[PDB]
Every structure is written in C-alpha cells, then in structure tokens.
Design a protein around this ligand. Structure first.
Ligand code: SF4
Ligand code: SF4
Ligand code: SF4
Ligand code: SF4
Ligand code: SF4
Ligand code: SF4
Ligand code: SF4
Ligand code: FES
Lengths: 129, 380, 339, 91
C-alpha cells in the first residue's frame, strides 16, 4: 500500500521550509504533493474535503509559525479552520490522523523532513481510506 | 421593568388569545400607532394542523392570527431575509426563529434597526401529519374534532371541540416515535432572550402573558402599548419568577439529556450513515430550508463540487462542505430534516458538530451578537 | 401571499405553497399538511413557482405571413371554429387540464364529430387500482420497471419505506446504474422482454408492480400479465393529471396527425409532428411557431381538480391571478361550443 | 547601501503584484464576514457589496477562503485553479 498525500504550504515559510529540506538534500518519502498558497489563510475546509473525496489518504498543511505570518494574521484563521476540520472529518469515517497541519519556518528543512516521514508512516499504517 | 404580566385591553383579543392576547395587542398597537409597516405572524388554515405565514399591513381582523400552533414548525428568518428585508417589521418568533434572525443580522442580511422581535417561549413543535396519526393512534379520537394543543404538564394535551381535554405523557409518546420533533427535544433555549421581548405562560396566571423585557427597544414597545391603552400590565409575584426559572432549568436539563441520547448513544453508526447517505437525491431541500444558508449562489452547485450524475452524492463534497461553511452557526431548527425527501437525519450531525465547536470556543449560534470566532480579525 | 397548490412537474401529487409578493410569484414554502409528500419536495417542486412568469405569452396569436401577430380573442375563436367545422381536425391533449376541462373537451370532441383525438400518453386504457402511496410499504413483493425514484422522487421515498418495512423489491431496466438499480434489493438489466416477464412469474398474488414510461413496449405485456395473476399496477404517468384526463379522454392511438389542435396548458407536450395545421393552446409558445395560439391560464391560476398517478384527487383554487388577456381552457371550450 | 537605495529612487517607479481579492457584485450578498479578516483593512462596503482597495490589499487570500458563496476570489489563486490542482494531484 502506497498512500496518496496532498500538501498545502504557504509561500513564505512552509514552502520555504520544504525548499530548505531540498537544498540540504534531506530525503523523505515521495508520496506527498505540495500545492503552493501565498498564506495558510488561503486554505479552507473545501480543499481538504475535495482532496479526501478525490482519493487522498492524507492531507498536510504547512504554515508560518504563529506570530511569523507574512500577512501577519493569516495562520490564525487557518488554525481555527483546521480545528473545525478535525472536528468534521471523523464524522465521515476519516481519522483525524490523516489530516496533519504544522507550522514550518522557511529555515526548518529538517523539521519538514521529519514531519513528512512521520506523516507518511502514520498514513501508511492506517491503510487505504 | 425586566418582568411583566400583560393582557390585551380588548376583549375579543383576550378571548381568542392563547394567554391573554398580549402578543396580538402589541402587534395591534404597533400597526395602529405606526411603529412598523407590517406584522409577520401565523394563521391557521383549514384545520389546526395547517399553519400559514401571513403578513398583516393593518390590524383589521388581526384576531384571526391569535393562538399557538404546536403542529406548525415554521421558520420566519429566511422569509424576512428573502422578501421583507427592506420594510420596518414586527415579527413573532420562537427561539429558533430569533436564532436564525440573529445569525442573519450579523451577516447584514437583516437590519436589526428595522425588525422588532416579539419572541415567544417555546417548549417544542410537532409535524402536522405525524401529530394527526399520533392522535388517531394513541388518543382514540379523530384527528378532526381537535381544536388546540398544549404541552404544559409534561403531557401533550388536545382539546376536543365539545370542551373535553385528553392528555398523554409526552415522554410516552416520544418513546414511541411520536410527539415533538427530535430537534425540539434537544433544544436548549425555551425563552427567546435573543428577541426584543420574550412572552410565555410559565410565570403567568390564567388570562395573562408573562413578558420579559430584554432590550430598550422592547421597553419602548411595552411602554407605548401601555400608554396607548392596548395592554394592561402589572408586576409578577417574584414567587412566580422562581417557578418559571425552575421550569426553564428543568427543560434545559431534559434537553441536555436528549442531546446525549440522540447525539452520542443512539447516534447512527458509520455504516448506518453510509446507508442513509446512499439515499440522497441531491435535491438541495435541506440547504434551501436552512436559514443560515442564505447565499445568492451556493458553492455546493459549483462544477468541482456538484454531483452531475443521477446518483447519490459523495457526502463529503456536499454535507462536509456545508458543515465547514455554517455548522458553527447551526441553530438546530430541524428545517433541513423536515424537508428531506429521503428521510435522512441531517440535523443530528449538524447539531453534533455545532456542539463540538461551541464546547471548544464557547460560541453559541443564534445567541451571540458577534460572529463566530472563525471570523475574528484579532490574533486571538 | 402564501397559497396552497399542486406541483405540476411530474405525476406525483405533491403539494407546495406559492409565496406571492404584489401579484407575482416570488418563492415556494413547504406544504407540510399535504399527505402525499408532507412538505417534502424535489428540486422541480421548489422551482415550479417560476413557471407562470417564464416566457409567458398572454395575447392570442394568429399566424400572419410567416410569423405570429397579436389578435383579439373573438378573431381567433373564429378561425378556430371554422377550422373545426370544415377541415379534418384532430384534438390532442396533455395530462395538464383539469378533470372538468377534460370532460368539456370530450363534449366538444363529440359535438364536432372528430374521428381522431385523445390524451398523449404511452400507457394504455387499463383498470388501474386506486392505490394509496402510503400503503406501498404494506406490499410484501414490489417489482419496479424503470427508474421510479428519478421519475417521481416522492414515490421512491415510499419505496424506501417499503424496503425498511421488510418488502423485497426487484427492479428492471435497460440500464444498470439508475437510482432504483443502486437502491433496489435486486436489479436486472434485461435486453429481452421475456427476461422480466419470467421473473414476474415468481411474484406472489397481490404484489405491486410500479411501472414507469421509460420502457414503452413493456407496458402492454406487463399489464396483460398483471391482469392475469392479480397484481396491483401503479403507473408513473408523464403529466400531473394524466390519470384525471384519461378518466374521460382515451389515449390517442393514431399516427396520421394533420391539422392538429394541441391543448397543453402545462407546456408539457413533446415536439409533435404536424402534417397540416397546428393550433396551440398553451401558456408559452416557445418551441416552434403555431398557426394559431390561444394563451391560457397556468395550472395554479385555475380552479379545478387534478388526479395523481396513485389516484389521489386534489381540488384547487387559484394560487395566482391569471394575467390580463388569458382565458382558462374551460372558457375557450364553452365559447367554442356557444359559437 | 547608499547606492542600493539610490537605484530604485533613480528608477522612480515600482511594480505592485496584482495578486489581490476581487468581489463579484452579482454574487456578493454583503454579509461582511470578510472585512474583519483583512489585517490591512482593504475591504469596505459600497452599495451593499464588498469592495477591495488595491493599495491596501496584499494578497494573502484569507478573505477569499472565508467567503462561503465564492463572491470573493483571489487573482492568480482562484478557487477553480486550486481545485484543479487538487484534482490533478490525485487523478
Ligand atoms: S427548535 Fe427549539 S425554539 Fe424551535 S420549535 Fe423546537 S423547541 Fe421551539
Ligand atoms: S443545518 Fe438544519 S438544524 Fe442547522 S440551522 Fe440549518 S436547517 Fe437548522
Ligand atoms: S452551502 Fe455554503 S455557499 Fe451554499 S448556501 Fe450554505 S453557506 Fe452558502
Ligand atoms: S434534502 Fe435530503 S435528499 Fe435532498 S439534498 Fe438534502 S440530504 Fe439529499
Ligand atoms: S416528486 Fe414530482 S410532484 Fe413531487 S415535488 Fe418532485 S416533481 Fe413535484
Ligand atoms: S464574505 Fe463574500 S458574500 Fe460576504 S461580503 Fe465578503 S465577498 Fe460578499
Ligand atoms: S486577500 Fe488578504 S489582504 Fe487582500 S483583502 Fe483579502 S484578507 Fe485583505
Ligand atoms: S504567510 Fe505563511 S502563514 Fe501567513
């Protein structure tokens, strides 16, 4: 079983963190697919639900650390949305461990690598949705 | 003046009024003295099971709208937002109506300065056809020949034409699958404090209405009706106020117990939910009926979400999307479940999600004046 | 403002409320008291309020050179009466008249001695039982021919109630992914008619057969088999008063139409080939240009009775006011008889 | 630093990225759940419809994600585009 994982990362920190992991050449499983947004505040539950409905076995969202958002308040709104999404997902048979959201700074390549590896292990263990 | 006992100075309005006719007298004063342009209320059709919204632009024959209708689970918020959002209005609202109106006001779909809310205390409503069948089965009478209903004693009470009264335990009827709608059994708010006035019969004598004044707009309404001589009012005992308080607390406790019953221990399983969702015909009756779903164009109908085949939609891209859109604002009015052609218990899941959100953030939909914390602009 | 009425979109007898603001229809409201649907409607039921306003034609039209030009009512009722008396006129109606209007149409058909006329419907004249849909759940065995849920969602609701009641439901169609196919106890995608009929041999006496018009050629054989062996047949007709009109007017079984008079107040008629002249009596011309046009009142602007497929009859007072210059089909018929 | 600061002042002009919110007046209901979500106050209400100021908007997309009906949409990050990307990632 090879899980299908979709990722959303803000342009300024989390996408920067993935770039840092790449430049340092920190290996991690190739299942994730990153989609760029300007801010984690651009992400809403419709995208997560669409991902899970289209065949995703896990959804990752990455943002700036609280207090570090380029647009200064977007990740707060995302954090609220993410808590609500964790509320909603188990009602349709989707474990909330299949939906991970983390704060990754632009220089935190190693944290991004570890998050990717661990999320892949979790989702693979859970098995197909 | 937080509390009053009021009744219409008129005598016909008192006679046909449910509890002294203070609501009708207030509406008559509001129309006659031109506080508002119109009154939105209910009027019975060809029987007590047929309730129809009416918009009275004058008080002539207003008496035809008096009396309660427990078999009329109607919603007025979306009517006001869709058709009457421009006129100065006075409306009679049950707590769920006031909750829908508050959720719409904070979204600027209704102007609070334009709408006067004479809310009514509410112990629950029943579906009309189901109520008729229940009366036929368990009261051993024709559904016809009944002219009133009431739930005061913890017993559902029907008042036959001749004058006789037949009461049966609302607990026993509910245990048998009849009585109040499930959402009404879970309902946590019986006194509409999210309205300008709250009128009921819990702290009230016979022939009088117990009115709690929530706002200064309500105070103006009351003092204008009393100065104009449309309602006579006096002060409650303050021994009756405690009886009303205890009644409200007991009803709230029962609502909490039924919330535990329907949302946790008798909640459908995931397999049962799958069987239900398999039925959905994608008719959007639930969204149309939902007062919180007011949008001119609905995202659920977009190509990337809308199910274009003649088969049951994926409950994610329909129900989960609507939940993410408004489930923090769900007022548990049960309108979505009432109109579903496929008999799916939608209000259960929506209320459970809203309960999770309220427990986490302390936001109570239809009661808080401000938007849900989801829409806060602060760094909180 | 809020007025009871019938949904005209299919033959289920669902009740709706029309919300009217200042003389125009502006919305729909749940008709919770109605027994057929208890205030539940599919999308079409909630959309029906727009029909009286959409492309409405409200002035009589006599085809001038090439096109259709306005005309007064007398000058059309004349040039229709002469057409009846002189030429070979065949009268075709949809299941959208009131029952009384259908009786009047039968009177007219006899008065002018027309030879070819009737109601446009693929179903034959049968002794359909008067079934209450609330009793569908009582049947132990239900055979469903055609996608009944899509044809009439609020009868598919009763089929679901029956399934929950323990009845075993078998569905037949030429497709294997319809709503009934998905939700049936057992589905068969038959390509030969006997395929279904053989299985119908396994039904107990007094079983239900819900048949839609999706498969026309099977209706005849299935009704013949049900006449034998004592099955209750529930049809899903095409129009909201096909049953009521059929009570008085036979189904049209002719195929040589020329100089036809179509009476479709509900605008439900499919494109009908006209070899000769085309009189159209409807609420909106749309479609193609008719030789004559007599605008009529909408289903909810009339007073009269309608019968659903199950056999439930509902008496209606107008929910809206008919626009100026349009007459009910009853008025047209009475004036034509008077002339 | 003097040279680097002089370069743009000699140029006399800079380009503003157009990745900004745009409101569909025909779809917007004036609910206003978007105005407070802009940290820069770029959204106001004119004629009962949300209106975005280009000079104040920075293009975070928070308001667009908040809008239920989809009247608000971010240029270059439209909902249809991200939905297409999600669909293609899995199909
Ligand atoms: S939901 Fe609450 S306020 Fe509304 S009818 Fe039921 S009990 Fe009354
Ligand atoms: S989702 Fe259902 S219960 Fe909740 S507010 Fe909307 S109609 Fe009422
Ligand atoms: S589902 Fe979303 S877009 Fe549609 S009406 Fe409800 S809140 Fe508005
Ligand atoms: S009302 Fe029922 S059948 Fe219609 S879309 Fe909603 S859940 Fe599906
Ligand atoms: S089932 Fe038929 S009659 Fe009932 S609402 Fe739908 S289209 Fe109208
Ligand atoms: S959230 Fe959407 S509908 Fe509401 S005001 Fe903003 S753009 Fe308009
Ligand atoms: S995109 Fe961001 S900055 Fe621009 S108007 Fe919306 S919330 Fe404000
Ligand atoms: S920019 Fe990364 S979270 Fe706002």
């Amino acid at each position: 079983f090879e899980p299908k994982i979709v990722g959303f990362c803000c342009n300024w920190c989390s996408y920067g963190g993935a770039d840092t992991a790449g430049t340092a050449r920190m290996q991690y499983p190739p299942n994730v697919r990153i989609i760029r947004v300007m801010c984690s505040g651009r992400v809403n539950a419709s995208m997560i639900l669409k991902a899970f409905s289209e065949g995703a076995d896990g959804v990752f969202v990455g943002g700036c650390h609280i207090g570090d958002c380029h647009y200064d308040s977007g990740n707060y709104k995302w954090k609220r949305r993410a808590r609500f999404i964790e509320d909603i997902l188990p009602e349709f048979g989707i474990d909330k461990e299949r939906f991970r959201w983390e704060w990754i700074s632009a220089s935190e390549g190693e944290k991004f690598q570890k998050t990717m590896q661990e999320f892949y292990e979790t989702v693979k263990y859970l098995g197909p949705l | 003046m937080k509390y009053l006992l009021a009744r219409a100075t008129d005598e016909e309005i008192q006679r046909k009024g449910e509890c002294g006719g203070a609501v009708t007298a207030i509406f008559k004063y509001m129309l006659d003295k031109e506080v508002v342009d119109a009154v939105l209320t209910l009027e019975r059709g060809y029987d007590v099971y047929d309730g129809i919204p009416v918009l009275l632009e004058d008080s002539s024959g207003i008496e035809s709208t008096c009396g309660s209708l427990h078999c009329a689970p109607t919603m007025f918020g979306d009517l006001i937002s869709r058709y009457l959002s421009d006129m100065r209005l006075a409306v009679a609202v049950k707590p769920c109506d006031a909750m829908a109106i508050r959720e719409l006001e904070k979204r600027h779909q209704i102007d609070p300065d334009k709408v006067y809310k004479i809310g009514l205390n509410c112990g629950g409503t029943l579906a009309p056809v189901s109520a008729r069948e229940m009366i036929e089965t368990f009261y051993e009478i024709d559904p016809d020949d009944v002219v009133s209903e009431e739930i005061d004693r913890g017993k559902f009470i029907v008042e036959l034409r001749d004058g006789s009264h037949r009461e049966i335990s609302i607990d026993y009827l509910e245990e048998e699958g009849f009585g109040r709608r499930e959402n009404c059994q879970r309902c946590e708010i019986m006194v509409p404090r999210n309205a300008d006035l709250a009128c009921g019969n819990w702290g009230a004598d016979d022939g009088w209405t117990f009115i709690e004044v929530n706002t200064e707009r309500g105070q103006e309404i009351i003092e204008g009706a009393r100065s104009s001589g449309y309602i006579e009012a006096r002060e409650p005992s303050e021994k009756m106020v405690k009886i009303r308080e205890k009644i409200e607390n007991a009803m709230i406790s029962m609502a909490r117990k039924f919330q535990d019953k329907y949302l946790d221990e008798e909640y459908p399983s995931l397999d049962e939910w799958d069987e239900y969702w398999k039925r959905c015909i994608n008719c959007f009756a639930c969204r149309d009926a939902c007062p919180v779903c007011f949008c001119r164009e609905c995202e659920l109908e977009k190509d990337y979400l809308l199910e274009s085949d003649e088969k049951a939609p994926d409950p994610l891209t329909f129900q989960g999307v609507r939940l993410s859109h408004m489930g923090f604002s769900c007022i548990n009015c049960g309108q979505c479940e009432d109109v579903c052609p496929m008999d799916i218990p939608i209000a259960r899941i929506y209320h459970r999600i809203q309960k999770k959100y309220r427990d986490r953030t302390g936001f109570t939909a239809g009661v808080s004046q401000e938007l849900p914390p989801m829409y806060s602009g602060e760094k909180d | 403002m809020v007025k009871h009425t019938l949904c005209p979109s299919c033959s289920a007898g669902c009740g709706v409320n029309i919300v009217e603001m200042g003389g125009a229809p502006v919305g729909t409201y749940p008709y919770r008291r109605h027994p057929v649907n208890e205030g539940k409607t599919c999308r079409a039921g909630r959309d029906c309020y727009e029909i009286p306003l959409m492309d409405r034609v409200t002035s009589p039209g006599v085809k001038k050179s090439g096109k259709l030009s306005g005309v007064n009512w007398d000058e059309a009722l004349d040039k229709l009466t002469e057409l009846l008396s002189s030429e070979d006129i065949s009268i075709l109606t949809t299941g959208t008249l009131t029952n009384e209007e259908a009786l009047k149409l039968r009177e007219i058909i006899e008065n002018f001695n027309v030879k070819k006329s009737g109601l446009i419907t693929v179903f034959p004249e049968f002794d359909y039982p008067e079934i209450d849909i609330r009793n569908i759940r009582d049947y132990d065995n239900i055979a469903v021919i055609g996608d009944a849920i899509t044809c009439a969602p609020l009868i598919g609701r009763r089929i679901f109630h029956a399934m929950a009641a323990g009845a075993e439901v078998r569905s037949y169609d030429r497709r294997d992914e319809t709503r009934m196919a998905v939700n049936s106890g057992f589905h068969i995608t038959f390509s030969d008619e006997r395929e279904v009929l053989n299985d119908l041999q396994q039904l107990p006496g007094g079983s239900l057969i819900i048949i839609t018009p999706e498969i026309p050629e099977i209706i005849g054989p299935v009704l013949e088999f049900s006449s034998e062996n004592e099955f209750d047949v529930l049809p899903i007709f095409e129009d909201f008063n096909t049953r009521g009109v059929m009570q008085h007017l036979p189904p049209v079984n002719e195929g040589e139409f020329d100089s036809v008079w179509l009476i479709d107040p509900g605008a439900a008629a499919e494109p009908v080939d006209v070899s000769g002249k085309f009189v159209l009596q409807s609420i909106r011309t749309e479609g193609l240009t008719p030789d004559i046009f007599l605008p009529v009142a909408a289903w909810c602007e009339k007073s009269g009775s309608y019968t659903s497929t199950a056999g439930y009859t509902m008496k209606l007072e107008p929910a809206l006011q008919a626009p100026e210059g349009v007459l009910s089909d009853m008025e047209i018929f009475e004036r034509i008889l008077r002339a | 630093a003097a040279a680097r600061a002089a370069i743009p002042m000699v140029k006399g002009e800079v380009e503003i990225e157009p990745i900004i919110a745009v409101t569909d007046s025909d779809v917007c209901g004036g609910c206003e759940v978007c105005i407070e979500l802009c940290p820069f106050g770029a959204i106001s209400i004119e004629e009962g419809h949300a209106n975005v100021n280009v000079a104040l908007c920075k293009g975070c997309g928070t308001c667009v994600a908040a809008c239920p009906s989809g009247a608000m949409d971010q240029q270059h990050f439209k909902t249809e585009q991200i939905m297409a990307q999600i669909e293609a990632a899995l199909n």
